[PDB]
RNA sequence: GCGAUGAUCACCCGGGUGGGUACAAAUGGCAGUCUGACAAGU
C-alpha cells in the first residue's frame, strides 16, 4: 500500500545491501574478469 | 555441492558453483532432449533434476544472457512458438512454462518435424503443429489464445508471419518475442540499419516496440526485438 | 438470423448470434470482453462431438482443406428452418464451400468477424459446459500428433527402432537358450550321460 | 540318495527368476510404445503381461471388454476404469499387426 | 600415411574436447540493449536503475538482473582462481587443435609430392615454396 | 545415422577397437569390420576379401 | 530433379565450375561423395558441389543435411560428366569439396563464390 | 532349575557423515570412426 514510514524503507533497504552484498561473492573479482575477458575473446575469435 | 538460485523470470535458474550455466528445471526425469548435461540436487531432502540451457544452440537463451528486462514466456502461460526446428529451444520453453502452462510449437520441414514429435511425447505440454506458419488459418483448430507469441523463423517476410499469427491467436497487450536475422533480410546494409525497419513494420501491425538486445557473442548479426501487442 | 462456426479440437459448434449484423459493430472488442458479455451474445445451436480420434483426424484434414464434412453438414442442415439467416465463418474458403452447399444462408467472412472467434476461443471453455480446459487440451495433444503422424506420412511398418530391439532380443534368446540346454544335458545325462556326446544339437538332444 | 537334482533345481529357480523378470520388462517396452501409460498403471509385470494378451489393441474399447479387463485382478484400485478413459486419450503410436503379434507371443512367453 | 592417420586422430580427439568444454563455460554477453519509450520527457529523465527499479551495481549485471524486491564455504579468491583455470583449460585445447591442424597440413602437401603427377616449385619474394600441377587430366 | 555416414566407415563399423589401437600406435588398420559376415565377403579368398 | 535445390544458372556453374579447376590444380579438391563426406565432419570444406543429374539423387542427398547442421554453403550443378572433367579426372562426379587453406594462392576467387553461393540460399 | 549335542569372546551433531557386497540404468568418461586414382589384360 505504499505507506512505508521513515523506518521502513531503512530495514527493507538493508535487506538489498545484504543480498547484493552476498551476490558480489559469486559476481567474481574485478582484476580476474580483466584476464578472464581476454581469454574469452581468444577462444570465441 | 553446486548451488542452484533463482532467477529473474521464473522457470530460470543460475547453478552457481564452480561452473555457472543458465538451467531449467527437468520436465521429464531421466533423459536428455539433445545430449546437454543435467545436474540433480537436493532440496528441502528430495534430489530435483535440471538441464542446462547453452546460450549460443538457443537464442531466446542467448536473451537471458543479454539481459532483457521483460520476458512473457512465464510459468503457467499458454506460448506460440514459432520455427520449431526440433526439441532443442521448446524444450526449456516447455520447461519454464510447466504443466500447467502449454507450449505450441509450429515447423514445417519435415525431416526436423519428426525430430519434434519424438520429443513431444515426453513432453504432455507440448503441442507439435507440422504446419506452415504463413497460413495459421490450417491450424486454428489445434491453438487457442495464447499469452506470448516467440518466432524464430528466418525467412525474410517474417514481420507478416508474425502478424497472422498474432492476430488470430495472441491475446490483446499479450507478448511478442521476435529473433531478427539481418543476412537474411538485407546483407548489403549494416545490421542496425536492417533492426530499424523490423521495429518499424512491426509496429504498423499494432505491436509496440518495447526493447531491442543484439546477441554477441553468442550470435552475429543477431537481435531479440520484444514488443506489446496492443490491439486497441 | 446471425450464426457463428466454431471449429474445436472437441467438435462442431453453431453460435447463434441475438443481432442479425453484429460483425459491422466497431466496438466488438469492447462488446466481447467478458465471459458473461460472450455468453449472452452467443448461443449454442447445435454441438456435433468427434466420437473417435480417427473420425476427427477425418474432420480435421477437411477444415484445412477447406472442405465441408457431413457431420458438419448435418450439423448445418439442422439449423435451415430458419428462413434468411447469415453464418460466420473464420476462413473464406471454408465460407465459400458452404455456400456451394446451396444452403439458406448468408454466408460472411470479414476481418470484423475475427475479434468475434478471437473473444469466443478465449472464452471457449467457460463457453462450452461440461468440459473443462484440461480435458480440451487433452483431446489438442492427441489430435494434434495424430495430424502430424498423417501429415508427416508415417507409416507403423517403418519405424526403424523395431529393428534395435529386435536384434537385441535376438541376441538375448540366444544366450538363455544356451545355459538352459546345458542345464538339461547335465540335469538329464545323469540319468543317460552318453548322448550329450553322440547329439550335439540342442533342439534334437 | 540322490541330492543333486535339489542343485539343478536351485540353478534353474533362479535364472527364472531373472529371465521372468528380464523378459516381462522387455514386454512393457514393446507394448510401452503402443500404449506408454498402460505400463504405469499396472506395475506388477505379470499382471501386465495378462492385461497385454487381453487389451491387444488400445483402440478396442467396449464396455463389456471393461467388465472383463475388470474382472481380470480387482476394480480395487480402478485401473480399469482407468485404462478404457485413458485408452481413449493417449500418446502411444500404433504399431502394426506384426509387431503386435510379437508382443503378445512373447508375453505368453513370459506366462509360461 | 600412417603419420597423417596419428595427427588426425589427435585434432580429433582435441576438438571434441574443445566442444565439450565451451559448452561447460559461461560468457557473459557483449550487445547493446536498447529500450523504447513513446515521448521526449521519458528519455531525459530515464535511468537505468528507475526502468529495471534495481540497485545501480545490480544494474550493469546482465545474466541475471534483478528488481529490489526479489532482494528484498569456499573461499572466493580460490573460488576465482579455479574459474580462470577453466578458462585457460580451454584455450590450451584450442591452441593445440591448431597446431595439429598445421602439422597435418603440411604432411599431407608432402604427400602429394609423392603421388604422380608433373609439379614446378614456385618460390615468392619472402621464401614460401609451393608446387603447382600440370594441367593433365588423371587417366 | 548410417546413411549420413561415409562408405569408409561402414566398412570397418564394428571393429573400433582395432581401428583405434592402430591409429593411435601408428600400425595398419583392420579391413573389414563388420561386414566380414557378409555372403559377398564369404565367397572372396586371400586378398580379395579386403578388396 | 525438384530435390536438387538450389540449382546454379549458367552464369554461376561456370564460375563454380572454374574454381573446382583451379582448386584441382593446387590439389585443393576433394572428389565424391564419401570422401566430401568426411570434409564435412573434419570440418575442413569451404563449400560442396553437387550434381543434380545424378540418378537416384539420394545417394548424395546426405550431405545438405550435414552441411545445414555445420553451416556450410553448398549448390548444385546441372551435369555430373562436367563436373567430373572440371574435377579432373575421366570419371563423372556426383559430388566435390574444396578444401580450407587460408594461405591458398585462390582463396579470393573461393571466397568471392562462397559468397555468391550464401546469396542462393 | 545351564554347558563340548559347544560357555565366552568406524566418525560426528533422537539426527547426520565414513566404509562393504549384489543388481540395474546413463544421449556420463576413456572415445577419436581407415586411404583416395589407378588396376587387370593383349
Given at each position: ?7 521502513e ?6 535487506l538489498?545491501?545484504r543480498?547484493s ?8 573479482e ?16 | ?51 542446462v540451457?547453452?546460450?549460443?544452440r ?79 488459418q ?27 499469427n ?9 507478448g511478442?518475442?521476435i ?12 545490421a542496425?540499419?536492417?533492426?530499424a525497419?523490423?521495429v518499424?513494420?512491426?509496429?504498423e ?10 546477441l ?10 520484444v ?6 | ?22 460483425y ?38 477437411s ?23 447469415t ?8 465460407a ?21 472467434y ?22 489438442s ?15 507403423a ?38 548322448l ?8 534334437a538332444? | ?69 475388470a ?35 512373447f ?6 | ?20 568444454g565451451a ?51 569456499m ?25 595439429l ?14 603421388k ?20 593433365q587430366?588423371?587417366? | ?6 562408405a ?7 571393429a573400433?577397437?582395432?581401428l ?14 563388420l ?17 | ?30 572428389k565424391g561423395?564419401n ?5 564435412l ?6 563449400f ?19 552441411c545445414?547442421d ?13 563436373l567430373?572433367?572440371?574435377c ?11 578444401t ?18 550464401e546469396?542462393?540460399?
Amino acid at each position: 500500500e505504499g505507506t512505508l514510514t521513515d523506518h521502513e524503507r531503512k530495514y527493507l533497504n538493508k535487506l538489498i545491501k545484504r543480498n547484493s552484498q552476498n551476490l558480489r561473492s559469486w559476481d567474481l573479482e574485478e582484476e580476474v574478469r580483466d584476464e578472464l575477458e581476454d581469454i574469452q575473446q581468444s577462444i570465441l575469435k | 555441492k553446486v548451488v542452484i538460485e533463482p532467477h529473474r523470470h521464473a522457470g530460470v535458474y543460475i547453478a552457481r558453483g564452480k561452473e555457472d550455466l543458465l538451467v531449467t528445471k527437468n520436465m521429464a526425469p531421466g533423459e536428455s532432449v539433445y545430449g546437454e548435461k543435467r545436474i540433480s540436487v537436493e532440496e528441502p531432502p528430495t534430489k530435483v533434476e535440471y538441464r542446462v540451457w547453452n546460450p549460443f544452440r538457443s537464442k531466446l537463451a542467448a536473451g537471458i544472457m543479454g539481459g532483457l528486462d521483460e520476458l512473457f514466456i512465464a510459468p503457467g502461460k499458454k506460448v506460440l512458438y514459432l520455427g520449431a526446428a526440433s526439441g532443442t529451444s521448446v524444450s526449456h520453453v516447455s520447461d519454464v512454462v510447466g504443466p500447467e502452462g502449454v507450449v505450441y510449437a509450429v515447423e514445417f520441414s519435415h525431416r526436423p518435424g519428426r525430430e519434434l514429435i519424438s520429443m513431444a511425447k515426453k513432453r504432455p505440454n507440448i503441442i507439435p503443429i507440422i504446419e506452415d506458419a504463413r497460413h495459421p488459418q490450417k491450424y486454428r483448430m489445434l491453438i487457442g489464445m495464447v499469452d506470448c507469441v516467440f518466432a524464430d523463423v528466418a525467412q525474410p517476410d517474417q514481420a507478416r508471419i508474425i502478424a497472422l499469427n498474432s492476430h488470430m491467436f495472441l491475446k490483446d497487450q499479450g507478448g511478442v518475442v521476435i529473433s531478427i536475422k539481418a543476412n537474411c533480410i538485407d546483407s548489403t546494409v549494416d545490421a542496425e540499419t536492417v533492426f530499424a525497419r523490423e521495429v518499424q513494420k512491426l509496429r504498423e501491425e499494432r505491436i509496440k516496440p518495447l526493447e531491442q538486445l543484439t546477441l554477441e557473442p553468442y550470435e552475429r548479426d543477431h537481435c531479440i526485438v520484444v514488443g506489446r501487442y496492443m490491439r486497441s | 438470423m446471425a450464426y457463428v462456426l466454431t471449429e474445436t479440437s472437441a467438435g462442431y459448434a453453431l453460435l447463434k448470434a441475438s443481432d442479425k449484423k453484429i460483425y459491422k459493430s466497431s466496438s466488438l472488442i469492447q462488446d466481447l470482453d467478458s465471459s458473461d458479455k460472450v455468453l449472452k451474445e452467443f448461443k449454442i445451436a447445435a454441438f456435433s462431438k468427434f466420437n473417435s480420434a480417427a473420425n476427427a483426424l477425418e474432420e480435421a484434414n477437411s477444415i484445412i482443406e477447406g472442405k465441408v464434412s457431413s457431420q458438419l453438414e448435418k450439423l448445418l442442415e439442422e439449423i435451415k428452418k430458419d428462413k434468411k439467416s447469415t453464418l460466420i465463418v473464420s476462413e473464406t474458403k471454408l465460407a465459400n464451400a458452404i455456400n456451394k452447399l446451396g444452403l439458406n444462408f448468408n454466408v460472411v467472412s470479414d476481418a470484423v468477424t475475427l475479434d468475434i472467434y478471437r473473444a469466443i476461443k478465449e472464452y471457449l471453455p467457460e463457453l462450452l459446459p461440461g468440459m473443462s480446459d484440461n480435458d480440451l487440451s487433452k483431446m489438442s495433444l492427441g489430435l494434434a500428433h495424430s495430424i502430424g503422424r498423417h501429415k508427416l506420412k508415417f507409416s507403423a511398418d517403418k519405424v526403424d527402432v523395431m529393428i534395435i530391439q529386435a536384434i537385441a532380443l535376438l541376441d538375448d534368446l540366444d544366450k538363455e537358450l544356451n545355459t538352459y540346454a546345458m542345464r538339461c544335458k547335465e540335469w538329464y545325462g545323469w540319468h543317460f550321460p552318453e548322448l550329450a556326446k553322440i547329439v550335439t544339437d540342442s533342439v534334437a538332444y | 540318495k540322490n541330492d543333486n537334482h535339489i542343485i539343478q533345481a536351485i540353478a534353474l529357480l533362479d535364472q527364472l527368476d531373472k529371465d521372468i523378470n528380464t523378459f516381462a520388462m522387455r514386454v512393457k517396452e514393446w507394448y510401452g510404445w503402443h500404449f506408454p501409460e498402460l505400463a504405469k498403471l499396472v506395475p506388477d509385470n505379470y499382471t501386465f503381461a495378462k492385461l497385454v494378451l487381453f487389451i491387444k489393441d488400445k483402440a478396442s474399447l467396449n464396455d463389456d471388454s471393461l467388465h472383463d479387463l475388470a474382472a481380470l485382478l480387482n476394480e480395487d484400485s480402478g485401473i480399469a476404469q482407468r485404462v478404457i478413459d485413458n485408452a481413449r486419450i493417449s500418446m502411444g503410436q500404433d504399431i502394426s499387426e506384426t509387431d503386435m503379434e510379437n508382443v503378445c507371443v512373447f508375453a505368453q512367453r513370459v506366462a509360461s | 600415411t600412417q603419420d597423417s592417420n596419428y595427427v588426425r586422430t589427435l585434432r580429433q580427439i582435441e576438438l571434441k574436447k574443445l566442444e565439450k568444454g565451451a559448452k561447460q563455460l559461461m560468457f557473459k554477453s557483449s550487445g547493446n540493449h536498447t529500450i523504447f519509450v513513446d515521448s521526449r520527457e521519458k528519455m531525459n529523465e530515464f535511468t537505468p536503475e528507475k526502468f529495471f527499479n534495481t540497485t545501480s551495481e545490480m544494474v550493469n549485471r546482465s545474466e541475471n538482473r534483478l528488481t529490489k524486491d526479489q532482494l528484498a564455504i569456499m573461499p572466493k579468491e580460490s573460488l576465482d582462481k579455479k574459474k580462470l583455470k577453466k578458462f585457460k583449460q580451454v584455450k590450451q585445447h584450442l591452441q593445440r587443435e591448431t597446431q595439429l591442424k598445421q602439422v597435418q597440413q603440411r604432411m599431407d602437401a608432402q604427400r602429394e609430392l609423392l603421388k604422380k603427377g608433373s609439379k614446378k616449385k614456385i618460390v615468392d619474394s619472402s621464401g614460401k615454396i609451393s608446387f603447382k600441377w600440370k594441367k593433365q587430366r588423371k587417366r | 545415422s548410417l546413411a549420413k555416414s561415409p562408405a569408409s566407415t561402414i566398412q570397418i563399423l564394428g571393429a573400433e577397437k582395432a581401428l583405434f589401437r592402430a591409429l593411435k600406435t601408428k600400425h595398419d588398420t583392420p579391413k573389414y569390420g563388420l561386414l566380414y559376415h557378409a555372403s559377398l565377403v564369404g565367397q572372396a579368398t586371400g586378398k580379395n576379401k579386403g578388396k | 530433379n525438384p530435390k536438387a535445390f538450389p540449382l546454379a544458372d549458367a552464369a554461376l556453374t561456370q564460375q563454380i565450375l572454374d574454381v573446382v579447376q583451379q582448386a584441382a590444380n593446387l590439389r585443393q579438391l576433394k572428389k565424391g561423395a564419401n570422401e566430401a563426406t568426411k570434409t564435412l565432419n573434419r570440418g575442413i570444406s569451404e563449400f560442396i558441389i553437387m550434381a543434380a543429374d545424378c540418378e537416384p539423387i539420394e545417394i548424395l542427398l546426405h550431405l545438405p543435411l550435414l552441411c545445414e547442421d555445420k553451416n556450410v554453403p553448398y549448390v548444385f550443378v546441372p551435369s555430373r560428366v562436367a563436373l567430373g572433367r572440371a574435377c579432373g579426372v575421366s570419371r563423372p562426379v556426383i559430388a566435390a569439396s574444396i578444401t580450407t587453406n587460408d594461405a591458398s594462392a585462390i582463396k579470393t576467387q573461393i571466397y568471392a563464390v562462397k559468397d555468391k553461393i550464401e546469396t542462393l540460399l
